[PDB]
Amino acid sequence: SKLVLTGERHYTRNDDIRQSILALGQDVNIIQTQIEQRLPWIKQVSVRKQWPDELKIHLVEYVPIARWNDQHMVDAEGNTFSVPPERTSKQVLPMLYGPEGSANEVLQGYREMGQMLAKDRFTLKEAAMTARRSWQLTLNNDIKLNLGRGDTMKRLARFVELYPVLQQQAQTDGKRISYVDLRYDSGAAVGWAPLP
């Protein structure tokens, strides 16, 4: 059972593989599946046996693009997985939120909207879809955008077209923009906060 692991490890420790093999008390198919079953952040694993007494293991992990709800994570391709927080918390990632089957759907929004916002240097820190399919975004500068259920792109354009006049308005009265609520035909409501 002498062990040689190949692959781009970021989350999986040696001791995870050691303790998956030790867990059985052997066959290359059984242990591949067992690594799968005990490491939920493994996407692919191939286990080739090798003389003398070696197990050469190829590991492919999921690669989070975002935290998903809070405890979990989601990769670019819509995969929902979990890493124990101990190994996750030095990372700074965007937060996605959705009801439990909806990662692919939230991620699709997240891409479209984040991409639009990137074109004027706003970046998405959180994006939250509700069961109702209402959308509430958080920018890096902690401005929350309330998009509701409708045309989210059109309302997001409103925010961008209207942001400069809010920033001088905020400058003047010496206050930060707290949120922008775009649940309107053609308008937007702006909540303010004291400066930090």
Binding site: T130, S134, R158, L162, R183, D185, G187, A189, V190, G191
Partner: peptide
């Protein structure tokens, strides 16, 4: 409830007090 606030703003152009409204 959030549904209500949403309707409150979109159908009536309501606001919470202390917010600024802009139309575009």
């Amino acid at each position: 409830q959030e549904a209500l606030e949403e309707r409150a703003r979109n159908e009536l152009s309501l606001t919470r007090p202390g917010e600024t409204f802009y139309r575009l």
